[PDB]
Amino acid sequence: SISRFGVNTENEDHLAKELEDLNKWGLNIFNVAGYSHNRPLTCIMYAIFQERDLLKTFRISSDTFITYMMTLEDHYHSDVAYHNSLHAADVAQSTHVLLSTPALDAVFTDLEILAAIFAAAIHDVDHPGVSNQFLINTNSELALMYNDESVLENHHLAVGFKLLQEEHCDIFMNLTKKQRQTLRKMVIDMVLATDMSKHMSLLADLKTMVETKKVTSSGVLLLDNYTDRIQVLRNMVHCADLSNPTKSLELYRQWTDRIMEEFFQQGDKERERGMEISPMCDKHTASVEKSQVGFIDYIVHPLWETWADLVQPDAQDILDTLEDNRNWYQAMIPQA
Numbered sequence: 206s207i208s209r210f211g212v213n214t215e216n217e218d219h220l221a222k223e224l225e226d227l228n229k230w231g232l233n234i235f236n237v238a239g240y241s242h243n244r245p246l247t248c249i250m251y252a253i254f255q256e257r258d259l260l261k262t263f264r265i266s267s268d269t270f271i272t273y274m275m276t277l278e279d280h281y282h283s284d285v286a287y288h289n290s291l292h293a294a295d296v297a298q299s300t301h302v303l304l305s306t307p308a309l310d311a312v313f314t315d316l317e318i319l320a321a322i323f324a325a326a327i328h329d330v331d332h333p334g335v336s337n338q339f340l341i342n343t344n345s346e347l348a349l350m351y352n353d354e355s356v357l358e359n360h361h362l363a364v365g366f367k368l369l370q371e372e373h374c375d376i377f378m379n380l381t382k383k384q385r386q387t388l389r390k391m392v393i394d395m396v397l398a399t400d401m402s403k404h405m406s407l408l409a410d411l412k413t414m415v416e417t418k419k420v421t422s423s424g425v426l427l428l429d430n431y432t433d434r435i436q437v438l439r440n441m442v443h444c445a446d447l448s449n450p451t452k453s454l455e456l457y458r459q460w461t462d463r464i465m466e467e468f469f470q471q472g473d474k475e476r477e478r479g480m481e482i483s484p485m486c487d488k489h490t491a492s493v494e495k496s497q498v499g500f501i502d503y504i505v506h507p508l509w510e511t512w513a514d515l516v517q518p519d520a521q522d523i524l525d526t527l528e529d530n531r532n533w534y535q536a537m538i539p540q541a
């Protein structure tokens with residue numbers, strides 16, 4: 206069991222100390238990155254898989270796992286401010302927490318659990334730090350490859366699966382042909398659901414499912430077909446992807462500062478190319494604080510309120526924090 210990726214002996218214990226919070230929403234991934242020589246995705250994934258005995262269940266060699274995860278992490282761009290491996294690590298750890306929510310206890314197969322965490326890990330890999338619309342508008346290589354449809358999300362999936370093609374990195378080698386085929390289907394579905402263009406429809410379908418939810422005697426949601434299970438899973442990874450505003454304010458503020466560095470850099474590229482400036486990427490006019498309030502009001506709260514509704518009362522503290530954080534950003538807007 207690898208205990209460090211660097212030369213700092215103090216980090217071994219510090220890292221292990223942070224990882225005591227592995228199963229908690231309150232885990233601090235920035236600290237994990239700092240104690241792991243900037244290997245938050247490799248280390249958190251190793252921790253999660255060991256926590257869930259997934260290496261044992263799926264006969265994944267520790268060595269193969271580490272090589273794959275190190276190489277996946279290396280395909281996240283460290284020069285992209287937000288969509289780098291720390292984000293992937295966070296979404297994976299957040300998915301790991303949501304999978305254990307009381308309301309979904311015993312609902313998912315081990316293959317489904319494996320699929321969801323893998324999806325989270327790969328879901329933004331090789332992200333260039335500009336939006337689908339920027340790629341489409343600039344007639345980029347990716348947009349031409351993918352015919353303008355879920356351009357980044359198709360690419361993330363292609364890289365993640367392409368990396369499994371080399372023997373030394375094939376973590377799914379000991380799954381059966383049918384298991385591999387089902388996992389690939391689930392992961393594709395989950396990653397494509399992280400395209401924001403799909404959010405309104407995803408939410409509508411989720412609200413719909415919440416309306417007719419059957420909470421069993423013992424308080425567990427009854428999700429008795431695959432169609433139902435994969436719908437909860439796609440919304441789970443989507444929720445994880447959109448979890449920053451539901452974290453402690455200290456964490457949320459750091460995530461905001463990163464996404465704005467990325468967004469404003471896109472805005473600078475648009476200006477540099479004589480393109481029309483995307484209003485919310487324009488550093489000269491856009492309010493960071495208004496943009497968070499609007500993002501919560503219009504996207505994050507409706508989704509989380511609906512998730513919370515689905516897993517009652519598991520997510521109440523998350524909903525509370527989100528509402529607190531929304532209020533903090535609002536109070537940061539100098540006008541009423």
Ligand SMILES: CCn1ncc2c(NC3CCOCC3)c(C(=O)NCc3ccccc3)cnc21
Pocket residue numbers: 399401446447449450460461464485496497499500501503504
């Ligand atoms: C730090 C918290 N966080 N996390 C994500 C995110 C975000 N958009 C992402 C873009 C990539 O796809 C998932 C959502 C955006 C973001 O999209 N901002 C623009 C915007 C869009 C609709 C409404 C208001 C504002 C803002 N904050 C974000």
Ligand SMILES: [As]
Pocket residue numbers: 207208247248249251252
């Ligand atoms: As580790």
Ligand SMILES: [As]
Pocket residue numbers: 272273276368371373374
């Ligand atoms: As490899």
Ligand SMILES: [As]
Pocket residue numbers: 468471483484485486487
């Ligand atoms: As923008």
Ligand SMILES: [Mg+2]
Pocket residue numbers: 328329357399400
């Ligand atoms: Mg993405």
Ligand SMILES: [Zn+2]
Pocket residue numbers: 292296328329399446
């Ligand atoms: Zn993401």
